[PDB]
Amino acid sequence: ALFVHRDTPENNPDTPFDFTPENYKRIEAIVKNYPEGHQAAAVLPVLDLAQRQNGWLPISAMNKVAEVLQVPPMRVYEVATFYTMYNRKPVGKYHIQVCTTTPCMLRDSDSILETLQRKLGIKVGETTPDKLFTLIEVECLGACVNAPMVQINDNYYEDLTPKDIEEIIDELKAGKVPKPGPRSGRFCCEPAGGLTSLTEPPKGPGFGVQAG
Amino acid sequence: DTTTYKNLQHHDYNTYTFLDLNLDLSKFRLPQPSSGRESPR
Amino acid sequence: SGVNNTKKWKMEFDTRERWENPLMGWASTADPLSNMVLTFSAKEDAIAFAEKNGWSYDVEEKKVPKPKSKSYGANFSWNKRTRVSTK
Amino acid sequence: SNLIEVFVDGQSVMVEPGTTVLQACEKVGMQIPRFCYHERLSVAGNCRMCLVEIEKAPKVVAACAMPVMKGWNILTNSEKSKKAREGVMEFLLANHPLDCPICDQGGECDLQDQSMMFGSDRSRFLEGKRAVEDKNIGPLVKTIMTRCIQCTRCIRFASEIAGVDDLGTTGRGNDMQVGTYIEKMFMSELSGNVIDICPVGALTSKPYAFTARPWETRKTESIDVMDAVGSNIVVSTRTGEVMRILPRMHEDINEEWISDKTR
Amino acid sequence: KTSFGSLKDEDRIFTNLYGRHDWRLKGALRRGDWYKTKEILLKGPDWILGEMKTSGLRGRGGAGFPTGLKWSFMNKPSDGRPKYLVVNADEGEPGTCKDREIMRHDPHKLVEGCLVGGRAMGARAAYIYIRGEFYNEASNLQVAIREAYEAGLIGKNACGSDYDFDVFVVRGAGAYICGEETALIESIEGKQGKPRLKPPFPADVGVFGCPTTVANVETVAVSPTICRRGGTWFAGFGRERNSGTKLFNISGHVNHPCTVEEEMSVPLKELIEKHAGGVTGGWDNLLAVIPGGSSTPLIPKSVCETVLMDFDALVQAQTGLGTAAVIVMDRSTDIVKAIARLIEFYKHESCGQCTPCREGVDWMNKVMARFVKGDARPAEIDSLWEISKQIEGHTICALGDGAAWPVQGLIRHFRPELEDRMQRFAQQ
Ligand SMILES: Cc1cc2nc3c(=O)[nH]c(=O)nc-3n(C[C@H](O)[C@H](O)[C@H](O)COP(=O)(O)O)c2cc1C
Ligand code: SF4
Ligand code: SF4
Ligand code: SF4
Ligand code: FES
Ligand code: FES
Asked: Which chain A residues are closer than 8 Å to E175 by Cβ?
């Protein structure tokens, strides 16, 4: 959105941030995930871990990650500004996302977006005053088949309708985080109208095995 | 059977599943190479 | 980064006193060779012209940039320090 | 030996391996247009202006980064190359702002001259332009970044010659922005060379800001006396005054770069 | 050898693509995984690439390139450097769910594919880059790697074999361009997700400055069973030059959108009638199809009834096969609105390091939004075509091509609609 930082009292280099002891063990594991040199490869996972330990990325975190990696902070800034999953402004306990590309706009995802706006009393990219919900319209998410979908903190709620997102919000507004997946008779990418690709069992080891 | 869904484990995953798993896996993995250098600086 | 205003030799004169006209501030001169600039295609010709017109010259021999070994793959090295960290 | 027979519009040229199309053409007298290649900095094909066709390849190749192969003829004045350059300048001048009589690189702009030689002559961009927030570095450099062209020739200089790593790219797309993500002084003993490196007046020098224009100037070649390096220097004069200091090219000393004291 | 588009469950290569049996080792080990992989590895690298080249397997990513010819680029021996196998699972293109639905419900296939492909090449380890929104899928895959390490299939003695291997899991941060060959590599290395110029090809200097061979999820997941069953078995499916099974995603304006495995060169009409029961309003109501995900042009219904689902066929159709994610329109749809949405997507996901996709994509976004509203004149459509042809080959990566091709398909088949909207706005 902005792609520039101005020192707010909240977001400033003296804003308090540090990793818990377990987070440091996760960091050294992550750095063992990449060679002895070229340890800057851990910028993305370590920065997601920072986003995960505090919910978002203050500049203090974006500098402490450079300190932890011994990398210049500008590279961490470049990374965080490039990738969209890194929240540089604070967001809510539940970060709502809605796909609006053609495979899900062509199934009227905007109906879900309307019924999701009126339920929260917000515009698209706004937050709620209770700091419990935010909202954005985003691009594809890889479940285009179950087209009308949303995403609430690392899980998908798919092929849903206005009733089946009002239900979801009423559950999120009570401490009950509900079950993800298709909110219909389906549970996966299967065709709804009965099995069509396979109903027989799967064959066992050695089936069709080549001579060798 | 092929009459119900059986990947229901991911209804019980927290924020720190992936990284705890990598922390477990770091023991299994080999010592990695080196560029004869601690960093490109 | 253009190099076409090179490729030709020239012949300048030593600059001289420039002062401000007291009326308006215009830069004045008493010499007429202030803006004298000629164009030659070789150094021999300019040396000949200057010797012919009785002027004393001082030469600056040609300056060419070195040919350099450029490689885009050196930006992505494993061992060297050419591994650039941005794009 | 380690040489390669290569053709440039039929004219043969023998060159070492590891070379480029651009060097091979410079060996003949033909320089390809540029907005990202400098010949001291790293290579990065960001402007897509060094696009020439090969005599039978189906497409174009970036000559700043493509190494050459045995038995290649390089067509610099063909129609594919010219169409490529025209498109690239259409793009570059689409979101560019009409600040030519303000921009201190008036008769010093490679964008201007390349639009004037290798480019089209008309805009079919009937939409609105962008605008970028300007940064306050310091008293030397003056960032007007709505007219930048994202060539990275400044961050490359910061990283590879000055050893700084305080300059980068934030965002992606038209909304991407070059500079510091925070208010910071890009202040070093080699910072004023970004003013020359930048082909565009996106960043200029504050002392010279608005004082003169390049055709007014008389360029007398001189040297520095601040330090004992002996850096070759140009002294540009306007009506018996000294307007600015510029570096000369010399590969044994002052490899196109001068300090900030001496400019 | 004609009109061959439907096959049986004996040949289903992703037998658990619906989460009906299991996804862990106890249940994927029953579907024929890790059977004789020890023997496959002890056979040799040349034999695996032979199976690849005989199978006629083209790349199941966007670009269909023959593997074997691709993986053989780093069969050459070690120059004192390691080697790596990077797997592409940044399933960011619209319409695409196949890598998601293999990642969950069948991870051990992918792990065996990594291992076999590495021994086909040489590889100290692998780096499965996966999307960032795919958190739970990545967790299932990490559990699978945990199970394989504990079982004795990866590590110091992988299936015996005196061949040591590791399978790492990198996790992106929400970009579509990172699915490129080299942008994936740069983001692994910990920089901006920006592609590279190619040359240098990733088979000589790639991730960490070391050789690599990027490969889609299913391209590797189908490799070990190809070696275990043979390329000729795999080449029997499809034509002589377009071979294999293929996962097919079907999206939008149809009664049952699903993901299905099916025989290559199947006709698309069979594809939508048999699987994913016919389009909304039936064949009476079809308007157009996008066989690729989004970086492929349209079909005006004249050449989808009698046109095969292949690389060569769709290339002859002025189109192309990508991730084989079919999208369908139903005459209830502003088509310019759809392509403008796709161009908004390409604008959001452009990296921005090369000028054509940095500028012209926003040109075309503005122009197509204007066409949607109708605030243009018909003399701008040819201009838009010219902007497309400028963006096409003068970019670094193929995202400019992918943002230009849909516009070309729209102008090539639905220009009277644009003219109608223009004259409507003019008269009003
Ligand atoms: C913008 C862009 C996005 C891409 N995204 C993907 C992707 O999400 N998944 C994928 O498998 N390939 C993607 N590709 C193509 C990859 O280059 C390809 O998958 C990889 O090179 C493997 O090639 P293969 O299909 O021959 O195995 C993308 C290419 C571009 C230009
Ligand atoms: S850089 Fe300055 S002189 Fe060149 S085109 Fe832009 S505004 Fe005009
Ligand atoms: S500021 Fe100048 S040198 Fe830096 S990217 Fe922009 S145009 Fe290039
Ligand atoms: S075409 Fe777009 S995404 Fe690809 S390199 Fe160029 S700017 Fe980046
Ligand atoms: S287009 Fe909506 S999830 Fe893919
Ligand atoms: S000079 Fe080659 S892309 Fe810029």
From this structure: 82-84
Token reading at A17: 């941030």
Nearest Cα of chain B lies from the Cα of A70 at a distance, in angstroms, of 9
- At a CB cut-off of 8 Å and minimum separation 6, what does E142 contact? B17, B18, B21, B22, B25, E169
Return the domain boundaries, chain C: 1-87
Q: D239 Cβ partners below 8 Å, 6+ apart?
A: C18, C26, C27, D216
E171/B18 touch (CB, cutoff 8 Å), yes or no: yes
Helix/strand/coil for E131: coil
Contact D249 C63 (CB under 8 A): yes
Q: Which residues of A touch B26 (CB under 8 A)?
A: 28-29, 32-33
Task: Tell me the torsion sign for CA atoms E43, E46, E47, E51.
Answer: positive
- A85, A21: one domain: yes
Q: Is E361 in the pocket of ligand 4 (CB under 6 A)?
A: no
- Report the alpha-carbon distance of residue D147 to residue D134 in Å, rounded: 10
Strand duo A94-99 + A150-152: pairing: antiparallel
Number of domains in chain A: 2
* A8 lies in some domain: no
CB contact (8 A) between residue C87 and residue E353 = yes
- CB-nearest to A78 from D133, D168, D183 is D168
Q: Which of D37, D149, D157 to mutate to test the pocket of ligand 3 (most atoms within 8 A of CB)?
A: D149
Q: Give A49's contacts in chain B (Cβ within 8 Å).
A: 19
Burial category of A99 from C-beta neighbours within 10 Å (exposed 0-12, middle 13-18, buried 19 and up): buried
For chain D, what's the residue count? 263
Domain holding A83, by residue range, is 17-90
Q: What is the DSSP letter of E410?
A: H
Rounded distance from Cα C73 to ligand 6 centre (Å): 15
* Chain B contact set for A67 (CB, 8 A): none
Residue type, D221: E
Structure tokens given for E203: 């088979």
Considering Cα of A69, then A71, then A74, then A80, what sign does the dihedral take? negative
Torsion-angle region of residue B33: left (phi > 0), alpha (psi -120 to 50) or beta?
beta
How far apart CA E185 and CA E162 sit, in angstroms, is 29
Residue C70 near residue D20, CB atoms below 8 Å: yes
- Residue A210 belongs to a domain: no
- Bridge partners of residue E125, in order along the sequence: E84
- Tell me how far the alpha carbon of residue E397 is from its chain's centroid: 15
Q: What is the spatial distance between Cα D83 and Cα E369, in angstroms, rounded to a whole number? A: 27
Nearest CA-CA partner of E58 in E231, E229, E182, E203: E231
Domain annotation covers residue A212:
no
Method: cryo-EM
Q: Do A46 and A82 sit in the same domain of this protein?
A: yes
What distance in Å separates the CA atoms of residue D102 and residue D83, rounded to the nearest whole number? 30
Tokens representing A168 are 């979801």
Residue D139, SS3 per DSSP: coil
Backbone φ, ψ for residue E89 (5° rounding): -135, 25
Centre of ligand 3 from the C-alpha of residue D177, in Å: 10
Residues near E420 by beta carbon (within 8 Å), at least 6 away in sequence: none
Picking from E358, E323, E361, the residue whose alpha carbon sits closest to that of residue E342 is: E361
A83, A191, A204 member nearest E30 (Cβ) = A204
Which chains share 3+ C-beta pairs under 8 angstroms with E? A, B, C, D
Residue E136's domain spans which residues? 25-236
Find which of B32, B34, B37 to mutate to test the C interface (most C CBs within 10 Å of its CB).
Answer: B37
